[PDB]
Write a structure and sequence with these properties.
155 residues; Globin-like; 70% helix; EC 1.11.1.-
Length: 155
C-alpha cells in the first residue's frame, strides 16, 4: 500500500500515542505551525485575536478545530493509503473554502513531526519518522492531485 506494512505499523504505533490526548496534540501542532510560519494564522479568521501561546491554549474553539483535524488525519492514516473517499471531501474544503496551498500542508506536516518527536521520542525514532514522513508525503501528493481535479493548482 505504497508504504510497506512495517512502515504503516510504525505510523499507526505513534498515532496511538497521539490518540491518548488528541486535544493536546492538536493545540501544540497548531501553536507550532503559527510560531514557525506566522502567515498560516491568517487562514483562521476566529483565531486572529489570539495574541499569545497561552491565549491559544485557552481557546476551546482552537482546541476543537485541532481535534476535528487530527481525527480526520487519523482516519486517513488508518486506511494505509486506501483513502480516496476520505481525502476527496478534505481536498474540496481546503482548496475551495479555506484556500490552503500545498506548501501550508508541508508546514503543518513539519509541525506534526516536531510535536510527535517532542512528546514521544522513544516511540518516534528515525525509522518511525521516515515512515510518518512518507505517509504525510502520500497524503499531500494525493490531495494535490484532487486540488488539480477541482481546478486548483494549490500554489
Ligand atoms: C494534516 C493536514 C490537515 C487536515 C487533516 C485538516 C483537516 C481539517 C478538517 C477535518 C476540518 C473541518 C472540516 C473542513 O472545513 O474541512 C478543517 C478545517 C479547517 N482547516 Fe484544516 N486540515 C489540515 C491542514 C490545514 C492547514 C495547514 C490549514 C491552514 C494553514 C488549514 C485550515 C483550516 C481552516 C481555516 C479550517 C476551518 C476551521 C473552522 O473554522 O472551524 N487546514 N481542517
Amino acid at each position: 500500500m505504497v508504504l510497506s506494512e512495517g512502515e504503516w505499523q510504525l505510523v499507526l504505533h505513534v498515532w496511538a500515542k497521539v490518540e491518548a490526548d488528541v486535544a493536546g496534540h492538536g493545540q501544540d501542532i497548531l501553536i507550532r505551525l503559527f510560531k514557525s510560519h506566522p502567515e498560516t494564522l491568517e487562514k483562521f479568521d476566529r483565531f486572529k485575536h489570539l495574541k499569545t501561546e497561552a491565549e491559544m491554549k485557552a481557546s476551546e474553539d482552537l482546541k476543537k478545530v485541532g481535534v476535528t483535524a487530527l481525527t480526520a488525519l487519523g482516519a486517513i492514516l488508518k486506511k494505509k493509503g486506501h483513502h480516496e473517499a476520505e481525502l476527496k471531501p478534505l481536498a474540496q474544503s481546503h482548496a475551495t473554502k479555506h484556500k490552503i496551498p500545498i506548501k501550508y500542508l508541508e508546514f503543518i506536516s513539519e509541525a506534526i513531526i516536531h510535536v510527535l518527536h517532542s512528546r514521544h521520542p522513544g516511540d518516534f525514532g528515525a525509522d518511525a519518522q521516515g515512515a510518518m514522513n512518507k505517509a504525510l508525503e502520500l497524503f499531500r501528493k494525493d490531495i494535490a492531485a484532487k486540488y488539480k481535479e477541482l481546478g486548483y493548482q494549490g500554489g
